Each structure stands twice: as C-alpha cells, then as structure tokens.
Amino acid sequence: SLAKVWMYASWIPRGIPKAMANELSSAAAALAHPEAIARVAQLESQGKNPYRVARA
Amino acid sequence: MNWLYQMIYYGVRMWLVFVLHSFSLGSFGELITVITDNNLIFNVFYIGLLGLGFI
Amino acid sequence: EFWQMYLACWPYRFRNTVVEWETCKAKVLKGSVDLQDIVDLLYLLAWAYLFWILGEIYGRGSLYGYRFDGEIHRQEAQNVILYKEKEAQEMAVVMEKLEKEIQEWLKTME
Amino acid sequence: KQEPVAAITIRTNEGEMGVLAGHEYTVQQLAPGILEVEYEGGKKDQYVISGGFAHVNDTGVVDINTVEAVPLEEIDHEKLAKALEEARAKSQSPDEAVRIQGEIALEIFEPLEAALH
Amino acid sequence: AIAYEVTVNGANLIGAGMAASGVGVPAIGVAMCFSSYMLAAARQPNMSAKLLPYCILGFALSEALALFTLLIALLELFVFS
Amino acid sequence: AIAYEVTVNGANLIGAGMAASGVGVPAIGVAMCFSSYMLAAARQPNMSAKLLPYCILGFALSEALALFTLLIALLELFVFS
Amino acid sequence: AIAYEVTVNGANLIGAGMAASGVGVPAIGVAMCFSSYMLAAARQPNMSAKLLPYCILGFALSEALALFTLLIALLELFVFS
Amino acid sequence: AIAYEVTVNGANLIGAGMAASGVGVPAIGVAMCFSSYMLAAARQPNMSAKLLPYCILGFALSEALALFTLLIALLELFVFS
Amino acid sequence: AIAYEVTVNGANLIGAGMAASGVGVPAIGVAMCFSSYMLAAARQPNMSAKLLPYCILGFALSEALALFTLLIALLELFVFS
Amino acid sequence: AIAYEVTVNGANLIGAGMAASGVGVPAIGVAMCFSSYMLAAARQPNMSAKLLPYCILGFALSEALALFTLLIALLELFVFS
Amino acid sequence: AIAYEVTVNGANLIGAGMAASGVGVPAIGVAMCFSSYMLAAARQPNMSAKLLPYCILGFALSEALALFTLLIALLELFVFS
Amino acid sequence: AIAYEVTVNGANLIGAGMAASGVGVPAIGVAMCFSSYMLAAARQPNMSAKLLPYCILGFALSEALALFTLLIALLELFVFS
Amino acid sequence: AIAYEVTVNGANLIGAGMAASGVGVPAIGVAMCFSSYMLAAARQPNMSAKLLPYCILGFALSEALALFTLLIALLELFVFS
Amino acid sequence: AIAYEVTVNGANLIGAGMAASGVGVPAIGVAMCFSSYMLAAARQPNMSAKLLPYCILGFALSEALALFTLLIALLELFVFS
Amino acid sequence: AAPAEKPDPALDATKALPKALEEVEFFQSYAVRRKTGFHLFNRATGSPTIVGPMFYNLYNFVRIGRVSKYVCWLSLPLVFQRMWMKNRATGMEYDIDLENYAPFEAKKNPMHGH
C-alpha cells in the first residue's frame, strides 16, 4: 500500500540520526540522577516542558 | 629441520594476518569516510559513538 | 542540577518530536490551526532558515560565499567549446592527410 | 504372524518410508503415529502405533515390534478433540513436569487429527 | 608519450560468451530447489501444500539472476556498434 | 590522440566456444532433478505420480537456460559477418 | 625507451561479461538456504516459525553480494566512455 | 576514423578447445543419473523396472547437451576457412 | 635491443570484472552456515540458543571474504587512471 | 576499409591445453559410478550381479565423452599445419 | 635477429583481478568447519566442548590460505610501479 | 588483402601449462574410488574382497585420463620447436 | 624469414595472479578433513585420540600443496629478472 | 606471404602459473581419502588397521599427480630461457 | 609403554563456556533499566534496532569508570575539526601554476623519483 511505500522510502532518511538519539537517551537514563528523571516525569505529568523549566 | 620450517611458517603467518587485516580494515574505513564526506547527509555517527567502537 | 536535568530532558525531547510532528500534521490536514500554533510555527521557520544559512556555511567550507563560481570559472566552458572546435578542425585535417598517405601506400604496394 | 503383504508404509523420526520386497536391510525408530499396510489384494489396513522398531530382512521378512497397535476405526475424532486443548493448556502451563506432557500428547494427537481428517 | 586511441569492434562479442557461460550456473540452484521440494514432499506429503510457495520463490529469484546475465549478453550486441 | 577503428573477424568465433563451455553446466542439474525424482520414488512409490509433474517441469526450465546458452553460439555465426 | 599510451575502448565492454559470469554463483547458496529450510521443516513442522526469520535473512543477503556483482557491470557501461 | 579489418585464422582452432573444455561436465550428470538409479534400485529393487525409462531418459538429455557442445567444435573446422 | 614502454589504460577495468566474478563464490559458504543452524535446530530445538552465536559468527566470516574480494574491485577503479 | 589476412601458426597448439583441461572433468563421474555400485552392492549383495551391466555401461558412456575431447587434441596437431 | 623489449604496465592491474577471483574459493570450505561443529554438537551436545578446539583450529587454517591468496594481489600493486 | 604469417613460439610452452592445469583435476576422482571402497568396507567388511576388483578397475582407468592429459604437455616440448 | 625476439615483462605477473587464484583450492580440503574428524568424534568419542594423528597428517601434506603453489607465485616475482 | 617469426620470452612464465593453478585441485582429493578413513573408522573402529593399507595408496597416487602437475611448472622455468 | 593413567578431571572442558556465560550475564545484568525516562527509536517497521538497546549497558559502565570517562572524549573535537577542514578543502581555490608545478603525491613526478 501507499503507507508501505512511504515507509520503505523514508526508512533511510529517518534512520540516519536514530542511533545518536537512542545513544543520548540511554546515556541520560544511565548517567542522570534518578531524582532528576523523576522530576522530569513529574513536570511532564503536569503538562510542562522540563527543558524550559531547567533553563529558566 | 621441520621445527624451523614450522616456526618460520607460523611467524610469517601471524605477520601477514596482522598486516593484511589492519590494512583491509583501514581501507574500508577510508572508503566509507570518502562516501560520507562526499554525502554530508550521511556524515553522522550513523551506527553510534560507542556502539561501533565497542563492536 | 542543570546538567542532570539537561541530560534527563533528552528522552522527553526525542519522544515528543514525533508527538509534536503528528499533531502538526493533524492540525494542517484538519485545518484546526490557531494563532499560538501559527506563532510557534513562524518561530520554527525562522530558526530553520537560520540553521539553513549555517548549514550552507558549513557545507561550502567558506564563511563568506561559494568558490569556483564567477565569470572567470564560467568562461572555461566556452573556452572548452572553442578548444574542442579547434581540436576537431585540426584532427580532421591530420586524419585526412594520414588517410591519403595510407591509401597511397596501399594502392602502390597492395 | 508371517502374513503375505505387498507393501507397507511406516512413519519415522526422519520422516515417512515405504517398504517393498527385497528392500534394503535397515532398522530405525518408529515415530508415534499411524501405520499403513497394503496387502496383495489391493486392500489396505491402517493401525495407530506407539513407537517401536521395524526390522526389514533382505530375504523379505519384516518383523515389527511395538508397544501398542489399534486400528483407526476404534478411535473417534470426537473424544480426540477434547484432549487437544488439554494438551495445549498443559504445554502453555509453565512447568517442567507438565509442559513435556503437553508436548508429547500433542505429538501423538497431531498425526491423529491429520489422519482422521 | 604518444596516444593511440583504438576502438575494437570484435570485443563487442567476446563478453557475450562469458555472460552466456554464466547464464547456466543458476540452473544448479534451480534443480536443487525443486529437488528439495521433491524430497521434503516424499518425507511429508501432507506438508507439500505450504512448501510450494517457498519452492517457486527460490526458483524465481535464481532464474532472475540467469535472466539478468542473459539480458546483458543480448543488450551487448543488438544496440552497440 | 589518434583514433583507429579495427574490426576483428576472429572474435566472431571465439565466443562460440566460450558459451559452448556454458552449455554443459545445466547438464548436472538435469540429473540432479531426475535423481531427486528417483530417490523420492524409492522413498515413497505411491507419490511417484504426484511428483512427476515437477520432474518434467524441473528439467525443462533448467533445460531452457541450456537452450539460450546454446542459441547464442549458433546465432553467433550464420548471421554475423 | 619509448612510451606508447593506448586507450582500449573495447575493454569498456569486455569486463561486462567478466563480471556477469559471477552473477549466477550466489544462486546456488540462495536456493541452498531454502533447500535447508524445507528439509528442516520436514524434520520438524512445529519449528517452521522460528527458522523462517533465519530463512529470509541469508536469502536476501546472499543476493546482496549478487547485487554488488551486478552493480559493477551496470556501472561499467552507461557512465564510462 | 580509419577502418582496419583483420581475419585471424588462428581463432579457427582456439574456440574448438574452449568448447572442448566443457564437453566433460555433462559426464558428471550422466554418472549422477546412473548413481541415482543404482542406489534407488538397491533401496527398492521392485522399483528398478519403473525407474529404468527415467534412467535412459536422464542420461540421453544430459548426453544430448554434451553432443551439442561437441558438434560445435567439429562444425568449427571442416566447413570454415 | 629496443625498448617500448606501453601503458594500457584498458587494463584499469579488465581486472575489475574478475574481482567482481570472485565475490559470489563465498555466498554458498554464507548460506551454508544458516543451513547448518537450521538442520541443527531441526535435530535439537533446545540447543538453538547455544548455537546461534556460532551461526552469527560464521555468517560474518564467510561474508568477510566476499567483502575482502570486493575491496580489490572497488580499489581497482576509482583511483587508478 | 582495409584488409589484413593474418595466419597465427601459434594457435595450432593453444587449444590443445584447453581440450586437455576438459579431459579430466569426467573422472568425477567415472569414480561416481563405481562409488555407487560399491555402496549398492554393500546395502544389497544379492543385487550386485544385476547392477553390474549398469556399472560397465555408465563408466563407458562417461569415458566416451572424455575420449571425444582427447580425440580433438590429437586431431588438432598431426593434420593441421 | 631483432630484439624488442616491451614493458606492459597493464599486467600490473590485470593480475590483481586474476588473483582476486580466487580469494573467495576458500570461504565455502571455511563454513564447512562451523557447519560440521554445529551438526556434531547436534548429535552430541556434551562433546561440543572437546570439538570446539578443532572448530577454532579448523577456521584459522582454512581462512589462512584465503589471506595468502589475498597477499599477492596486494603485493602486486602497492610495491610494483 | 595482405598475408602476414606469424609463428608464435611461446605458445608451445604456454600450452604446456594449459594442459598442466588439467592434470590434477582427475585426482579427486582418483581418490574418490578408494574413499568409496573404505565406506563400503566399513558397511560390510566381508564384501571387501568382492569389491577390490571393481575398485582397481575404477581406480586405474580414472588415473589413465590424467596420463593422457600429462603425456600431451610432455610431448609438447621435447620435439616441437 | 626474419626473427623478431620480444621480452614481455608483463608476463612476470600474470602467472603470479593465476597461481594466486589456485592457492585457495586446498583450503576446502583442510576443513573437509577436520569436519570428518568432528563427525567421527561425535559418532564415537572414544575414537577421538586414534584419529588425531590422521587429523594432523591430513593437514600437513594438504597445506603443503597450497604452499607449493604459493611458493611458485612468490618465486615467480622476486627472482626472475 | 611473409614469414615473421616471433620468440616470446614472457611466455616462459605464464604457463607456470597455470600449472601452479592445477597443483591445488588434487588437495581436495587427497583430504577426501583421509576423511573417508576417519568416517570409516568411526563406522568400524577395529577395521581401522585393515583400511590403512588402502589409505596410503590413495594418498600417494593422488599426491603423485600433484607432483607431476608441480613438475612441469618447475621444469618450465629452470631449464627454458 | 603401558603406563595405565587414570582420567584427570582437570584436563576436561566443562567450565570454560559456563564461565564465559557467567561473565556475559554479569555484563548484561548492568543493562537492566527502569521504565521512567525510557525511549528508543525503533526502525521504520516498528521493530527495535540492534545497537540501540545496548547503549545503556555501555554507558552504565562509563558511569562506573573513573578516568576514561573524563579523558577519552578529548579526541572527539578532532573529528569535527576534520569535518570542517574537509569541507574547506573540497572547494579551495588554488594557483594553477603551483598546481601544475607541485602536484601533491602525483605519479610520474621525477622530483619524487618515479
């Protein structure tokens, strides 16, 4: 179908940066303090952007 | 005499193994980097910073 | 504290890239796009245009502008056209001369 | 007991085999399933078995020893059907004592389910 | 140094021989693929129905390789001078 | 650079042997198929009738590549100058 | 000593068959993977689902070397003069 | 461009050897067919009478391919100049 | 004696076909590992987890030789004039 | 166009080596015949006498193909100039 | 008599492909070792520890000749002019 | 047309190596016979006496073709110029 | 008649590439021997030691033939002028 | 017609790489004999003594052809100019 | 000559593979991660990647390192240095006379020797 055609066409574009994204996500889950990760989850449950909060 | 022969044979074998495998691996690396330098959409850590290195 | 939160926020950002993209697609198709969405998209396009210029600078390799462009470099195509015209003009004469010589040698000996 | 037979078809772990007069001398496991016998008169006779060993002589004398032998006529798909999902539940129930029993009951029921159908 | 460009028209055909030598190689994988379906059906006739897609799939790809080699051989002559 | 077109008539004939060497490669797959049918028959005589359609099939398509490989070398001579 | 540089244009097309000859060798491995998977399924029908992933893996990836064996011959003609 | 035509009489006899190299490959198919017939009859002597035509068939087809290759080598000399 | 150096530019490509022709021979060894793992699991399913590392290891090694052969073909063209 | 007849006397002997290379392929089938007849006679000694003509026949037919290739090699020299 | 020394520079890069064709022929034998180790452990898992030395022993030796085959082609280019 | 006769003397020693390449191809079919004799003796040691007449016959006459291939290359040199 | 001697310095290397292509064929006989040892040990662990001398004898004078070929290819270059 | 004799000195060496390419193909036949001996002993351990006389005989004469194939390449060089 | 030696259990091989699997299990035990903050970009099909889910283990070991996690990154700016200088060099304008007189690593240059 057309969804499959779009999938197989956009695979190679979409997959170039996926490695660094997963690397950064896992390194964050590992190296960052779990209290900080819990605070991020808390703010995300509160509908806020925790990155903007941290910068502020 | 075959002891000398086997020693020489396996020494030369180890030398060839190290040299040729290093050279081939570096050559493949350089060709891949040429492809990615000529196509900067791919000049990205596409496998990963630590994944490829660990492997 | 900021370093820990900066790291910890990366999963949220990478997770919400796809989420925000899907909502933007839904809002454009459905047409339910409002003023705040328009402002955020305009901010997005401004930053994207800036990084487009920045990527041009990075890809060119020069900070001022492209290289090997200009009339000094474009004229070489016309120079090549003229040089090939002259080369073919001389090569036809030389080939005709050599062919006459060979046809002479053959019709004299063979 | 030493009956004249034209041909016989057997089930094994390797697969299914056919045996004729003067067949090559061979011995191998019987897999728990069905068995087909064809007499000289063109008729046939089918028997459910539970493993065993079959020895084929070069002279043409086949000695078969099994733990059980019952025709297909004396089995019904009705009573077989209930035991199927029982074997499946035993296979899915995580337990070393019951999983193998489920697997084995399924191993014997699947040729029966395919043969009755 | 001197520069003699040559265009050999006989070499329009030599490659076609080697391509035709490589068209027959996949026939081995063809026969091996039908043979495997034969033996697997002899060992288990009831399973013969669902191994047929695997058989035709293997044969079609192997035949495509032969076809591609043959296509090069036939495109080498009737258009090139 | 100078341009000398040359026409090698000898190359009209060389490729014929090169494809001829490729005509024998399917011949082993031929017997690979017939042997498959034979051993499957000894496995199960009763299935001999149902695998025969895949014998003649499994040969002829493998034989077809042997024909085209043979076709070229015969087309290579009586039309090409 | 004298130096005659020559440009053999026929070698643009000779190599096409030379690479083409190697396009059918992988077919035997490709069909071999299915000839294995068939017999394995005939040995154990229930395990057919766990071998199918490792049945298409080698299938397409042996054809990938065939693809690079073919991609050279197609890169040999329509770009080189 | 300049047009030089050459006729290599030596190529009359090279391709004969190039074809002669491939004449021996179908012999393996021949012996494979006979080996299959032998092992099948040893497995089931009763089936021997049913496989005898197949044996005669599988030889001849394989043998025919060899003959065609051989024919080319003999047709290369006694008619061509 | 006289001394004529010749630089054949056509030889930049004639070797590339041969290097490309040798890339497909390891593909049979490639699929031989997955076939072995298939038959091994078909005889002992419980051991499938302990032999999978050997399976991946063998695929890479067989594939590497084909990949090593490929380096010559790609190194033969894009740098040499 | 220009016409050069060339006679390459050296090609009288180049094809003999290729034919001689073809002479050794059939030995694989030669031994495959006896290798079959042995195993057959082992698995059934009684049928060893009835498979005897097939063994002689199969050997002779494989060997005849070899002989034809060898005959080309001898005919290539003692009549040709 | 007359004497013309010629230095053919194309053979620097022809033989590279001629050796490159042979680098993959060991790989099909390389995978035989690990296939054997697989099936031998499938027959007897407890012996898998005692045969694994002979498995590693079987790889590095079979792989070595491929490397030696790869040496010449790399010895052919990066030292000879 | 003009008649240039050439006598290539090096081909006399090239065809020696060309036929030499085919001297070892029988050797696999030479040792195959004793391999079959070993497997048959292991199957039925009492039959080992009845088989060795049909072994030496299949052995020597598989070796014989190698002699016919070797003699050529040795007759090629010490008489021809 | 007039005598034109030529010394082709490119021929120093073509044979080296051909021999290099021939260095790999014993590698499959090495893993053939070791695979045989593996299957014999899995068939009978108690015979693991008695066939180890043959495990070494099969490799030594098999790898040696690979070395004689390799010895020629390296002797072909570093001694001949 | 005019007689242009040519004595190609490079041709002294090309054949040596062909004979060297044929020194390898006996090695698989060599290792086949010991592989048969191993599996025969694993089939019948105590028979290992009465098969070894029929094991060295197939070893030497398979090795012998390699020697003669190896002989030519060494006889091609150190005596010929 | 006929020593009659009993089998020595120390010469057997029944612990090497178990020990290697113990080491690998100790390795993979440090890959255990919580659900909070978990994200992994799957493939376009939706199936997981190969290298993706085995980054947390490596970085959990980097967490436990002491010096390499503060030293081995100092060679990474050099990669971006190359990325930038390469792009500068792909289009660098140069003198034709100097390029024809002193080509870098060109063949058949008699000043080099060949």
Ligand SMILES: COCCOCCOCCOc1ccc(C(C)(C)CC(C)(C)C)cc1
């Ligand atoms: C520098 O910033 C300039 C911003 O320019 C904004 C241009 O205005 C665009 C507004 O367009 C719309 C579109 C839709 C609507 C609807 C009808 C959907 C009403 C709404 C947004 C109140 C729900 C309103 C305005």
Ligand SMILES: COCCOCCOCCOc1ccc(C(C)(C)CC(C)(C)C)cc1
């Ligand atoms: C989907 O869109 C994302 C952003 O794309 C916007 C594309 O804009 C085109 C920009 O084109 C240029 C190119 C060059 C330049 C110059 C060289 C004039 C800029 C300069 C002098 C700052 C380097 C300016 C604009």
Ligand SMILES: COCCOCCOCCOc1ccc(C(C)(C)CC(C)(C)C)cc1
């Ligand atoms: C311990 O090792 C033994 C030493 O081996 C001696 C080497 O072999 C003898 C070679 O000596 C030659 C050299 C040249 C020749 C000529 C040139 C006279 C032979 C010829 C005319 C046949 C080419 C003959 C013998």
Ligand SMILES: COCCOCCOCCOc1ccc(C(C)(C)CC(C)(C)C)cc1
């Ligand atoms: C596929 O690979 C198989 C190769 O087998 C290798 C066998 O050797 C394994 C050695 O590994 C170790 C390493 C450390 C250790 C200990 C835990 C004893 C180290 C110590 C002394 C620090 C506690 C034990 C075994």
Ligand SMILES: COCCOCCOCCOc1ccc(C(C)(C)CC(C)(C)C)cc1
């Ligand atoms: C000294 O030798 C020990 C080195 O061992 C390294 C083994 O490398 C493989 C580890 O990488 C992985 C792979 C998979 C996985 C997890 C992804 C098993 C799968 C999971 C967590 C989803 C169940 C974790 C780590």
